[PDB]
Amino acid sequence: VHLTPEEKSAVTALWGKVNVDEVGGEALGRLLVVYPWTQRFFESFGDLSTPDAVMGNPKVKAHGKKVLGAFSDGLAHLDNLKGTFATLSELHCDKLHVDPENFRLLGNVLVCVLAHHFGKEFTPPVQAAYQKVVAGVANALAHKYH
Amino acid sequence: VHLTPEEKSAVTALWGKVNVDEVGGEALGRLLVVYPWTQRFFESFGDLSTPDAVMGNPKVKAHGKKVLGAFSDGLAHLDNLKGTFATLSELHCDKLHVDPENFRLLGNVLVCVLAHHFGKEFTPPVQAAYQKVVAGVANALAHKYH
Amino acid sequence: VLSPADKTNVKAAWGKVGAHAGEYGAEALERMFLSFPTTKTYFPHFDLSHGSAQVKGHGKKVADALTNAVAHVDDMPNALSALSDLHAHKLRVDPVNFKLLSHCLLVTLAAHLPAEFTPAVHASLDKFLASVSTVLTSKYR
Amino acid sequence: VLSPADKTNVKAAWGKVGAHAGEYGAEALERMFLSFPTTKTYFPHFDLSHGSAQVKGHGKKVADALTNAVAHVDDMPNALSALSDLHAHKLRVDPVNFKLLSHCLLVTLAAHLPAEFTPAVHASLDKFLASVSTVLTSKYR
Ligand code: HEM
Ligand code: HEM
Ligand code: HEM
Ligand code: HEM
């Protein structure tokens, strides 16, 4: 999927206002709360028993920082998302065994977290550019699954 | 998505044994019986009230012949499915308004109809090559939806 | 199953929407048409421009349906029955699309009611909209 | 809802499977692993080769579960309860995948039992497997 020059500008300017550390912690916690089966991957993280436990877990906040840092560097290469996310696709499949459906779930939680933070600035057109971007990143993470 | 040289050979040899007229009538009738909301597109066809009505409707058998003839010519160009199905993508979107989800439903009914007809010849590997082929055709029919 | 706390969460988020329920339905629809353009295949007879009267009126109808689902959340099948007959026998919207409109409703509420849209509330709303979707496709086959 | 005729259809298709139910489960699994390779992410601890003992044993367990769902088709939640707890609290298979295993079960039955697999039977089996899937994800959230 491709972005018009105008969808690209849109995306790049909102992202310039995003604290990638805090929004990554927030998106990953929401994913564990809203789709609780995603917690199967994070037995080592500790107490994930309740929404306040999950949203205040230090190890969940640190993994979100890492996941959203990688995404954030994807956004510098929207032309080449499959080469950018290729080593990571390989790891998620070969070493972590993560079903790629989880990548689409995370993508939708992140759109909700962006909405929540920017409000009126997260217009129907800016949402449409981010929906294309998160589907592209989910597709490049799944491309190299065998 | 791409086919290995061996998946291509697989596909091409089974198709060489397919009566495209009868299998098209059969796949489209099964689609109307198994997912009855697909009948919204075919009010002109007549009595679609029961499975025997649907499976014996002359206008449904003639539309299946036409749909599966176009598919069958797709199979001569597996390298270039998006250029092959581009005019048709345009028509389904602009003039017929068919949600592209229906293309994926049809693809799965056709795999079941191929199973039913070939039996033991429709091996797990040959099924896997056809699943890739019908997803490719569904994606090329939906590519040009705006 | 919606838990007693889900129900309380849903009753209080939706209570804050209040008299903007019209406005929020029209906005969720517009979001759905731009983000998932295959949903427009069901509205060939509408002007789908921004500000459109048809979308404004239809967003009001969809929001008043959800308000009533919320008022009758312990008995939603009976309350949405007519609407479910309508979707299954006339409109015949493919079931895959209720997820799409469900996601754009959550985005609209995240954007308008952020103090309310906590992680526990987000989770209760996602379950509630998945469940409305289920009642509305229950008579398809 | 499964109609009385759906139930009769399902009871008689599945009755023809009989003592091959083991064999058919193992084959449906193998079909699922080749056609949808993201499902293998749930079996990292299995040899997924053709002929594999692990897949043969697991196909038998899955088929005997369906045989029991068929024997108790007017009360499937109660009959599959333990299994649904298992999928929701331990295995935590994403719900999207029950459709995948459901499609490969239909292909296996189309291929082995064609005289039975009429359009009305195909429609009853698709509804029955969608409904087993629903009971098995009913406790996820
Ligand atoms: C945009 C989506 C994603 C990106 C960009 C991403 C990126 C990353 C990165 C960078 C790592 C670090 C691996 C390393 O540094 O070698 C990682 C590890 C991991 N990811 Fe992902 N990831 C994504 C989505 C997810 C999702 C949705 C799940 C599961 C729910 C997941 C599960 C994991 C797990 C389990 C690990 C290993 C955890 C650990 O290191 O202890 N990832 N991911
Ligand atoms: C492989 C999938 C498909 C192919 C290759 C295909 C191909 C065709 C072709 C060739 C036509 C003739 C149009 C013309 O000759 O100008 C057509 C018309 C049509 N198709 Fe499709 N089609 C496919 C799937 C479907 C599905 C799944 C639906 C709906 C359930 C659908 C609905 C229709 C309708 C409503 C028409 C017009 C019917 C009419 O002409 O009266 N198609 N399609
Ligand atoms: C929460 C989910 C939904 C609710 C609550 C809902 C509710 C409604 C309501 C109240 C109406 C008006 C019926 C009447 O006037 O009697 C309706 C009509 C309609 N709905 Fe749904 N709906 C939902 C999902 C969808 C989806 C996902 C689609 C398509 C993508 C859709 C397509 C339509 C269409 C095409 C009409 C007729 C529009 C017209 O001609 O005015 N609905 N729906
Ligand atoms: C009709 C759908 C399904 C049925 C009837 C079913 C039934 C079963 C049964 C009976 C077991 C064995 C539980 C036990 O020994 O106590 C089980 C285990 C398992 N199921 Fe499911 N299942 C279904 C769908 C799925 C799907 C779609 C997946 C993954 C894609 C899956 C993954 C597993 C796994 C990983 C186990 C544990 C395997 C092991 O370690 O032996 N199941 N299922």
Instruction: Write down all domains in chain C, each with its CATH number in brackets.
Output: 2-139 (1.10.490.10)
Q: Are A60 and A54 in contact (CB under 8 A)?
A: yes
Distance from CA of D72 to the nearest CA of B (A): 23
Residue whose CB lies within 8 A of the most ligand 1 atoms, among A88, A91, A104, for a mutation test:
A88
Distance of CA C108 to the CA centre of its chain: 11
Angstrom distance (rounded) from CA A130 to CA B79: 31
Work out the minimum CA distance from C124 to partner chain D, whole angstroms: 10
Residues 98-127 of D with CB under 8 A from C: 123, 127
D78: tokens are 């109660």
Q: Is A41 in the pocket of ligand 1 (CB under 6 A)?
A: yes
CB D79 within 8 A of CB D72: yes
The end-to-end CA distance of chain B, in Å, is 22
Does residue B70 have its Cβ closer than 6 Å to ligand 2? yes
Q: Which of A132, A108, A126 is nearest to C30 (CA)?
A: A126
List the chains bordering chain A where 3 or more Cβ pairs fall under 8 Å: C, D
Q: Kindly provide the b/e burial profile for residues A64-78, where b requires at least 16 CB atoms within 10 angstroms of the residue's own CB.
A: bbebbeebeebbeeb
Query: From CA C103, how far away is CA C129, in angstroms rounded?
Result: 9
CB half-sphere exposure, A81, CA atoms < 13 A? 20
Nearest protein Cα to ligand 3, atom 37: C91
Residue D96 buriedness (CB in 10 A; 0-12 / 13-18 / 19+): middle
- The rounded distance, in Å, linking the Cα atoms of C26 and C20 is 10
CA distance to partner chain A, nearest, from residue D75 (Å): 26
* C24 Cβ neighbours under 8 A, 6+ residues apart: C17, C59, C63, C105, C108, C109, C112
Architecture of domain A1-146: Orthogonal Bundle (1.10)
**HEC assignment per residue over chain B:** CCCCHHHHHHHHHHHCCCCHHHHHHHHHHHHHHHCHHHHHHCHHHCCCCCHHHHHCCHHHHHHHHHHHHHHHHHCCCHHHHHHHCHHHHHHHHHHHCCCCHHHHHHHHHHHHHHHHHHHHHCCHHHHHHHHHHHHHHHHHHHCCCC
> Are A109 and A30 within 8 A, CB to CB?
yes
> Are D44 and A97 inside 8 Å of each other by CB?
yes
**C20: its two tokens:** 């903007």
Q: Is D138 on the interface with C (CB under 8 A)?
A: yes
Dist. CA A134–CA A137, nearest whole Å: 5
Domain ranges of chain B: 1-146
Closest CA to D16 of D104, D95, D120, D121: D121
Nearest CA-CA partner of C83 in C31, C139, C30? C139
Residue A116 to residue C126, Cβ atoms within 8 A:
no
What's the rounded Cα separation, in Å, for the pair D8 and D6? 6
Residues of B in contact with D122 (CB under 8 A): 30, 33-34, 112
Indicate if the alpha-carbon torsion angle C103, C105, C106, C110 is positive or negative. Answer: positive
Which amino acid is it at D41? T
User: Taking a C-beta distance cutoff of 8 angstroms, is the pair B122, D111 a contact?
Assistant: yes
Give yes or no for D111 touching B (CB within 8 A). Answer: yes
Structure tokens at C33: 């048409």
Which residues of C fall in the annotated binding site for O2? 58
Q: Which candidate, D139, D2, D140, D141, places its Cα nearest to that of D69?
A: D2
Experimental method: cryo-EM
Binning chain D into helix, strand and coil, the percentages to the nearest 5 are 75, 0, 25
Q: Cβ separation of D34 and B128 shorter than 8 Å?
A: yes
Q: Give residues with Cβ within 8 angstroms of D69, minimum separation 6.
A: D76, D79, D80, D128, D132, D135
* Amino acid present at A144: K
